[PDB]
Write a protein that binds this ligand. Structure first.
Ligand SMILES: CNC(=O)[C@@H](N)C1CCN(c2nccc3c(-c4nc(-c5ccn(C)n5)c(Cl)cc4Cl)cccc23)CC1
Ligand SMILES: [Ca+2]
Ligand SMILES: [Ca+2]
Ligand SMILES: [Ca+2]
Ligand SMILES: [Ca+2]
Length: 622
């Protein structure tokens, strides 16, 4: 890194030299008028080179050699180690005329070398390495580098009704565990020469994205100092002489969104005082880049950790079955007296730390969710703005492109339909997360308009494969037609959930045509899913489903939607239809090793283990 340091006419120039740079010095400009040649002397820790246009010749400490003065003959000054005393190191140039061997004048350069390095964990191993060259850039992949920073959205101290990042304060030593470390490492004399200061700084744009902290008095009662962030764009650093390391704790405040890529930068500069009324000049600048970790969703294939359940006191039939199914599995259960519509359990991870984050958009919050190691982020709205109209596939590979965290699926309407669609802000937020490349399916053919009404995923136990379960109106009519022929014709359906029989349903011509159109809608999605998830007909199961068409021309479940089930590894919590429909579902799913359990019904939301795959090992599209 070449830096210009000109010699000033017959005068000494004193300057700070930052290690990692090298000086180019002009000696012709400072020479007196009539000077023909020049000579030089330099100290041991200053390699000096006389450069006569291209060719650079190294020069001895006390050389008596003289070179002709020319604007194309310059110097190249390089230092390798920091100074222990302010001046010490120097370059001296003597000037002579045509007839004379005693200097007619001399210009000097007194130097003070220091090392300045703003270091972060760019290699992603949890420890702040010394000056990673790739720290001023963020690259995706297992062979890529760049520091990662979480959003501090949990509540270490539960008194305040806001999250850790809503304030510009740190109250606990636990809060520092959710922060990324940034160390300012320096070497130099006891003090900086007169006219120099080191300043840490951020842009106005990045001020509502990061929060930089310092631990003052760490040997007794520790206090935490907010030095960069909201309304603090720069901070003057106290220079400690010799070999020093200043520890900083950086926090994220924003998730990547529409207009926020996720990348933030923190800079350090050595500013040189020129005069009063004039701004200090950044002589040296070192920068570090951080990527704010995205909010990631968890598919049904990931193992369950704990089941959150919301219902009423009278919902004892539901409560017993859900607890009996949760007993079969090796996971815990929580009760709350909207559950799968207003909240969703996701996670955030960094090389050092990782914890679950709940996204909540209420159409005040829920106490059983906010706390330590559990983030809680909160937000016109149609019925399509719901967490039921959101799904996430297991990891897929679609024509060479792997999606190791799956893909988010969102319900929508056809482009020229004029129908309902999720808000542009939600779609932009999920898209901005990048790691789960969202796909828009067609759910507007349903009265509610949710993708969980017609689809879901189940793993194949003891394998790393899964199945897409699709609602099928044709599967229902084929089952009915068979039972009607087998003698079960006048049998009453939904006995415990009108007086309807198979014969009555099959005779209803108008209902046949409605379900014919609804099967078309289901197959439109089946094609988008096979296309965007790399699925074949071997990976899909058709569960019998029946619908009724409202005045808007949309579907609404005739009997309980069996596809919206609780997936707890090999154990499925399927909604009871009120039984040949249950025996058909047991015949489709049970031979594959999936134990079915029909529930009476208000809903559930399962917190799962995050993926083994670290999101930063991915390589997403632009
Ligand atoms: C730490 N703070 C920050 O980083 C903030 N600066 C960000 C945080 C993210 N923000 C949001 N933007 C869009 C959608 C959001 C949803 C959300 N809400 C729903 C939903 C469910 C029912 N409704 C009616 N809406 C569904 Cl489906 C999906 C999502 Cl992501 C929830 C909660 C926050 C959202 C923007 C501001
Ligand atoms: Ca490291
Ligand atoms: Ca805090
Ligand atoms: Ca914290
Ligand atoms: Ca925490």
């Amino acid at each position: 890194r070449e830096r210009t340091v000109r010699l000033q006419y017959g005068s000494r120039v004193e300057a700070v030299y930052v290690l990692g740079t090298y000086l180019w010095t002009d000696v012709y400009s400072a020479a007196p008028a009539g000077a023909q040649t020049f000579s030089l002397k330099h100290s041991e820790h200053v390699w000096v080179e006389v450069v006569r246009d291209g060719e650079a010749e190294e020069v001895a400490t006390n050389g008596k050699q003289r070179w002709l003065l020319s604007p194309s003959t310059t110097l190249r000054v390089t230092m390798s180690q920091a100074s222990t005393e302010a001046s010490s190191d120097k370059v001296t140039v003597n000037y002579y005329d045509e007839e004379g061997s005693i200097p007619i004048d001399q210009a000097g350069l007194f130097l003070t070398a220091i090392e300045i390095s703003l270091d972060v964990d760019a290699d992603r191993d949890g420890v702040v390495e010394k000056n990673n060259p790739k720290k001023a850039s963020w690259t995706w992949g297992p062979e890529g580098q760049g520091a990662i920073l979480l959003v501090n959205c949990d509540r270490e101290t539960p008194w305040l009704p806001k999250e850790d990042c809503r304030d510009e304060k740190v109250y606990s030593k636990e809060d520092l565990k959710d922060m990324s470390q940034m160390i300012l490492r320096t070497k130099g004399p006891d003090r900086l020469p007169a006219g120099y200061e080191i300043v840490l700084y951020i842009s106005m744009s990045d001020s509502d994205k990061v929060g930089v902290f310092y631990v003052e008095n760490p040997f007794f009662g520790q206090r935490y100092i907010h030095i960069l962030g909201r309304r603090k764009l720069y901070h003057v650093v106290k220079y400690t002489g010799g070999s020093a390391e200043l520890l900083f704790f950086v926090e994220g405040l924003c998730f990547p969104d529409e207009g926020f890529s996720g990348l933030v930068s923190i800079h350090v500069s050595l500013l040189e005082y020129m005069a009063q009324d004039i701004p200090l000049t950044p002589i040296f600048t070192d920068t570090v880049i951080f990527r704010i970790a995205p909010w990631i969703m968890t598919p049904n294939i990931l193992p369950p950790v704990s089941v959150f359940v919301c219902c009423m006191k009278d919902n004892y039939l539901f409560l017993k079955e859900v607890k009996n199914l949760v007993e079969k599995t090796n996971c815990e259960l929580k009760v709350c007296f909207w559950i799968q519509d207003e909240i969703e359990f996701g996670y955030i991870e960094a090389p050092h730390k990782g914890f679950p984050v709940v996204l909540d958009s209420p159409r005040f919050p829920v106490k059983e969710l906010l706390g330590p190691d559990f983030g809680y982020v909160t937000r016109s709205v149609t019925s399509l703005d719901s967490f039921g109209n959101l799904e996430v596939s297991p990891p897929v590979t679609v024509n060479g492109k792997t999606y190791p965290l799956g893909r988010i699926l969102i319900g929508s309407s056809f482009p020229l339909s004029g129908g309902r669609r999720m808000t542009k802000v939600v779609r932009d937020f999920l898209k901005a997360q990048q790691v789960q490349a969202p796909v828009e399916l067609y759910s507007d053919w349903l009265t509610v308009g949710h993708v969980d009404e017609f689809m879901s995923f189940v793993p194949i136990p003891g394998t790393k494969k899964f199945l897409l379960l699709m609602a099928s109106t044709s599967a229902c009519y084929k089952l009915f037609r068979e039972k009607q022929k087998d003698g079960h014709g006048e049998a009453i359906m939904f006995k415990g959930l009108k007086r309807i029989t198979i014969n009555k349903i099959l005779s209803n011509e108008s209902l046949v045509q409605e379900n014919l159109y609804f099967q078309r809608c289901l197959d439109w999605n089946r094609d988008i899913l096979k296309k965007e998830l790399g699925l074949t007909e071997q990976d899909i199961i058709d569960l019998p489903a029946l619908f009724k068409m409202d005045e808007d021309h949309r579907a609404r479940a005739f009997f309980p939607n069996m596809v919206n089930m609780i997936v707890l590894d090999k154990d499925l919590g399927i909604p009871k239809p009120f039984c040949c429909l249950e025996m058909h579902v047991r015949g489709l799913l049970e031979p594959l090793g999936l134990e079915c359990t029909f529930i009476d019904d208000c809903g559930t939301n399962v917190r799962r283990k995050p993926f083994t795959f670290k999101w930063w090992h991915m390589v997403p599209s632009r």
